[PDB]
A paper describes a structure:
Upon cognate ligand binding, NOD2 oligomerizes and recruits RIP2 via CARD-CARD interactions. Eventually, the NOD2 signalling pathway triggers an inflammatory response through NF-κB, MAPK activation and autophagy as well as the production of anti-bacterial peptides, which protect gut epithelial cells from both residual flora and pathogen invasion. Our biophysical, structural and functional data show that RIP2, via its CARD, can form helical filaments, plausibly nucleated from one end by activated NOD2. Furthermore, we show that RIP2 polymerization is essential for NF-ĸB activation by NOD2, presumably by favouring recruitment of downstream effectors such as the RIP2 ubiquitin ligase XIAP17.
Residue numbers in the entry:
A (entry chain D): 7 to 458
B (entry chain A), D (entry chain B): 2 to 458
C (entry chain C): 2 to 457
The structure:
Amino acid sequence: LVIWINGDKGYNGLAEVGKKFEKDTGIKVTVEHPDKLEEKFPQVAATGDGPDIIFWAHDRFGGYAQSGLLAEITPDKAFQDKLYPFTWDAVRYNGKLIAYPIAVEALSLIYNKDLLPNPPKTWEEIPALDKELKAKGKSALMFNLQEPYFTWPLIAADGGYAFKYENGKYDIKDVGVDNAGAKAGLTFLVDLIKNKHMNADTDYSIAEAAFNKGETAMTINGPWAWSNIDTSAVNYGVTVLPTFKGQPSKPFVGVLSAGINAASPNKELAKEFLENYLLTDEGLEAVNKDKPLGAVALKSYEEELAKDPRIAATMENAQKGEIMPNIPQMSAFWYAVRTAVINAASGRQTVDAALAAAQTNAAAIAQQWIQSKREDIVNQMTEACLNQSLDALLSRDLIMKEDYELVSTKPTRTSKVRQLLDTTDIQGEEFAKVIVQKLKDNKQMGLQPYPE
Amino acid sequence: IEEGKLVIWINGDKGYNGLAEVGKKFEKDTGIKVTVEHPDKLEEKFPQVAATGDGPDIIFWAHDRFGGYAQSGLLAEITPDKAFQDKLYPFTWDAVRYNGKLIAYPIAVEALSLIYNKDLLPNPPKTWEEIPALDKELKAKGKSALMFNLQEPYFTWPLIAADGGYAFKYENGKYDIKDVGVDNAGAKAGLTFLVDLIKNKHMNADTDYSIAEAAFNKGETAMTINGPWAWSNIDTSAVNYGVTVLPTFKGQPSKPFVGVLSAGINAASPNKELAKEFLENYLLTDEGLEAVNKDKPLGAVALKSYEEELAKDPRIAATMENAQKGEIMPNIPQMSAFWYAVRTAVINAASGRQTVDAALAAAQTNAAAIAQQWIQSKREDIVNQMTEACLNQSLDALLSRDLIMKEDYELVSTKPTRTSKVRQLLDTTDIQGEEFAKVIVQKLKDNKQMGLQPYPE
Amino acid sequence: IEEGKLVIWINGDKGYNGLAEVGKKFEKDTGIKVTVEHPDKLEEKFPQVAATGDGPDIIFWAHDRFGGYAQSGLLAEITPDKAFQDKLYPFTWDAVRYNGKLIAYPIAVEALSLIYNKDLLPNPPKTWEEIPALDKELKAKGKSALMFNLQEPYFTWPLIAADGGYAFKYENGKYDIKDVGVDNAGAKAGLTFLVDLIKNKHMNADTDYSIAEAAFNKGETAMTINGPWAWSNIDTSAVNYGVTVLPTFKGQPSKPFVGVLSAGINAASPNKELAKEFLENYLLTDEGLEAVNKDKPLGAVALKSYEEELAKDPRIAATMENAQKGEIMPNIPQMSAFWYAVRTAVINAASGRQTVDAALAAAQTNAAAIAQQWIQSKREDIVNQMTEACLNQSLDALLSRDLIMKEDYELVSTKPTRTSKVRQLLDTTDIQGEEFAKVIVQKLKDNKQMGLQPYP
Amino acid sequence: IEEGKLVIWINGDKGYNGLAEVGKKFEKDTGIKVTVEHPDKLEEKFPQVAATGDGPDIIFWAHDRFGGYAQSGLLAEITPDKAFQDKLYPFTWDAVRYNGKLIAYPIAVEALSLIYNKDLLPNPPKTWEEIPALDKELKAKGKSALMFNLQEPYFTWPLIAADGGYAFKYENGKYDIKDVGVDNAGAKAGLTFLVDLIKNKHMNADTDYSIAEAAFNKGETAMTINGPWAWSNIDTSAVNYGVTVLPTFKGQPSKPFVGVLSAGINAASPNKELAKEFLENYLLTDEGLEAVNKDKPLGAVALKSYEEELAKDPRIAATMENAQKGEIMPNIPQMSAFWYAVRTAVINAASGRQTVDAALAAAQTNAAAIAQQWIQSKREDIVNQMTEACLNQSLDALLSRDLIMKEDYELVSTKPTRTSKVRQLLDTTDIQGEEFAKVIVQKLKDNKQMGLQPYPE
């Protein structure tokens, strides 16, 4: 068995669960923690190779499931009762369970009790608080601005959202990163950076190091981070995220899930490891001891963790927040918002411009419209429309030099358009808008209803 | 405590060496030796030591603490004859009357005044709102406008009460213990302005009494807020000064709490009749009061004959003008809780750990003291009726919220029995505040201790 | 680090807001903006950050840490002209001279003094031995005799050195790095007396700087031990106080270590010439020093012209009298090891985890730092010449004595090669202390690695 | 002062009402009215008022202060005929002889004695070393062993001198003013033992004369140390008491200083011949002395005829036995400096501000008084020769060491000229002690005032 799990989680703890599995049933386990395992998995598993079993938040899994990468798990309904019922809903894609829920996790405000005994319950008082701490040679807040997971709580607060819930399923066309609530949140984050309260290029390692050394009074982070703080022994508390414009911060709530690779031979060996070794009270605490899982999906072990007020704070944040969608659109949404946060923070773009760009990118209206009528476009695109698209795309630097030549050196106009539509999926949504414009310019009225 | 001798406890800021000379007159005349001591936190030391038995024969403090001592049975119920009651002012007797019983002898009325340096500032400000502006000008000449004790809430209260804050509402005859007004907009407005002065570098958050007096008496600041007692040290330094009315806030005047320095006799003393001779025939006389007043001013005295002289001095005229605009302290037992509730809110907001809205909201619940008094009302019932599970549930939950110290937790649990553990828990509820008490009353309601009578809400 | 601007690092207890005003004069005049920061553990943060590259342009600390920075190549070798060298005192230049090279600008000489409350105690004690008696009397009146910072060894050292303790012996010209005197009877006697005061409830084991100053400035204790910098806050509270000579122990006087607050320039800064203008022409002048001194006293300054004024003040006269009776700190790189070796011994003995004889015996070996430096002297030879058996024998024996953490052991053994494992072992020897190193040097001697040169 | 009438000054503890009756006999006979006053600090009031002119006609005090008044020209040089000199004892004349000149009339020899309660303690201790033990036993029965005036050094000196302390060494004929023995091991040993009694709760540091007499006369303590004058009040209370020899220390006996109560005439009085009639023919007679002695005992009188009767009383026999073992006070002007130097050292060591070694080392330099007398020897030269720089340097340095009060500094500097400023500085050097003088003599030597003659060392 080869297990892939994120580096910030308790991998050495999960390695000890593997050595128990090795000692008992004989099968050796290897727990690896490669970088960008969320992006490495869909590459390697699509061909065939990779890990037997993958550990990540439930949002990426429905995208893997639509791609046929994950094995459709079948735990018996006596086992389904041992885990919480809403954690199963997190890993249910089109009436099919695709991974085992391990633990619910959400972001919390983590504050230094010695530097700040009464922490702020509003974002609006943090600028003021920082000015006071600057006098004593410290800062108020410091957290990871690179990843959009951490900054999203602020963005969603006043009224931003990834995809609207249409009371039963998510509307893939109604994206809310553009709306005034979303602008207001990000504007405030940019303003903190502009007024020297925060620093635009602060990553996870900068943030944790600062708070754990006692150089800043507050950080925003999940359960996993608590392990390192205990070591440094900065007298700390975990509490509810500060409010913005009266309304509470809404962090996206992840369910750390374990899905089995569809291209693995060891499908039955993984189910023994998950159901009978990991998802047990002994197994989960071996992981939790190394680096906290959060509030676990296993009912029996959550009973103990609920007593700890840190988990009580984590669940209070998760209640006020909302659960991530598992749908395949989320991967596009995430790296669309990633850019908008980083550009606005560094000051290359404005907030209005950055989120307007991420609005179209997260939606993917053209890129999905092309995908919906894929074969029709291959058959119905004229050789003029192809060249018009190829010219206009090259004039806006949207095609690389290798990608342009790889398209045009195909034998036929049928195969060229195919190779063009292969690169539309790879090269983003602004790429697709050009082609859909040229298809509408040349009046390819055989393609069905157009976007707008 | 010792029979034969008198042991007097009085605050250090007052004229204790002057009162010591009244003792040497008593020693020379009637033979009984007198010892005047001035221990720190004598307001908090007295209810500890006198409850067991020992302590002073006679206690000198403002009248607000006395009704709390009286409800605790610590003070002797004094019986001066009605020929003597006419020698002191009638409203000063009302200050020391607890449930139709006189509990101490009124010595002097005292209230805070604006004390300004005439050389640095000949026309002092009549509004708080112009002090920020005035400070900026004095910063140019290497000085500051105002500087006073921010630690004690007595001094900062004038500003808080001005716009409409209050300790406990008067129900035209007695105080409503449930209607507390430290939370209201008037109270917020006052404290906000005090915080703003500190935030804009006009004042300094951690300024105590010794910092303030030293600064004004050396001529480093143009104004201070203080009572009569402070005038003695200012005369020595000879900073040409005047005492006047406190500045207005939002048009309305500052309302300082008015204290009546009272002398109560300890109920556990053998020398009850020896103290009454010392008070009525030696201290409360024109010779006796001026011996104290010479050392460090008493204020406007309760004795009619000696007030006649002190009324001529314009400093006392200023003190009484402030006291008129202000209002008299309640003597009720709730005040001790109110005071250290407001003490925290002022200090936290000043230092900038909490906001004003948060700090006063915390002090609102603490001053009201609903749980802490509910525990006190059914004290012995809770000792008998609390389960050993409820005890441990409370002890666990209190330790998880850092409400118990490490010494206090171990001192409770190392008691021999549950009856004694719960007793020791309820002993620390009175000491450790009101958020402490809310945990226990929650656990008593969780375990359904129906023996206990109606619950708070 | 940023070219254009100056970033100054100085300790929080000193007058940093005063030095900030010297920066605003520099900004107003020559245009270059100055930022005065005061981070915690700046003595330990500087060698980390400056070794890589970044950090402050200019560093303010006592001269003892500087020779360790200088041996590490962190400090820029300053070249003030000999017309400027005459403006400061000649012995203050000797304080900042490392191997015939001037490494920082001397700002001010500083030493500890007995600071007493005249109202509570008009005639202060001239012997340590009468303080237990004096405390019993003040306990009756609801106060204490003495109260000072027991955490830092700077403050408790005066007592330790008195009867005959010493950091490193002077061999009439240079310090003998192998002759350490924290173990000697004189040193034991001093620390024993400090422990006895704590054991008899006269002092409290976990009293830090903020506890001490607050107590004396509020008028809760009659005496404290502190430097010039503390006088500023006492004036504010206006506790009628005097500064005087430290009390004697066993007849001999207390010997405080004497610091020279020095300003060294970072070798990895682009603004080397901009700092020299700030130091020589703006800070080390009569206007500049008094702007700092007004905020929080520097002490007895190195600048001859401004010392002329400060010498008149009897507090400085008391400070210099203590400094005469004491002795000047070494600047050598061994001092950093000495200090945190004595820090532990003082705190353990005070809290009562160890005895004085045990605590100082531990600090004796640690301060000497014989194995850890011997490993460093033959570092690459040990990487090449250590057997894989000797590695595992060391790793086993170190783990059995709880000297390696669980993370550090696994990080060593998961290296690819035996060459890289030993490297990672010797990387952790520098971090993890001297008792760690004694195990490895024992195993290298057990396996007879007679290619390594003379042993200890 | 007034011509016609006599105004007598005598200490309050002595029999002043008895001496007033001798005045009414003088009034009835010769017509001149007499007024006997008893003002506080009359030892220190006399040299002030008599130096200008006014004061009493005749002064009653122990002979030690008189040679200081005589050197100051305050006392009239008396000339009793040698037929009258035989009526008083010859060694009492030596007590009042300053540089071969008789300066006052000797009235009575007085010395301290151990005065014990026979009912509480029938066999009194003959050693100081057993008093700690004796006190522990009496503490069980609710009483104390010893209690006496610790404020004045007269009473504690017996213990100090015992082992080998002394004021000024006798150089077989005159006293060596430079050889002072308050510092020596014998002196340290004595004071150490006195401090130890106070430290071990046997005695109380702040016990004055009124505390001591009241305690012994009420029967609250078993022993006191006091002179003859105190016996009058003890008889009234009728505590069955005995007077005996002072307890030994380290084997050697306690050496009390022996005073000769003397009556000197003011040099600035017009009634010099009227006082000599009052002294020789009315006071120093058998009728006159017993009128005083009846009110409050004089002691062992200087008048031979009346001592014959008083010698029969065993209390006087005990008093003389103490006086034999002790030694007679010097009359020299240095004694006034010695006394208030030792006064401080006793009080500081007793209260525990200083150690005994530190306190007596301070009093050693102060009693010797090298600078203060050097200033006095070249007083007018220093007024003329001190620069205005040296004045200000002294005034600055003296103020930095808290040696000048705030009133004294301003009173010097507000003089019109430098000649008058230095005069006012040297006026306060005599009042304010010897460490004050060392500063000025340092500054005079710093500025190189070579006009002034040889310097001290």
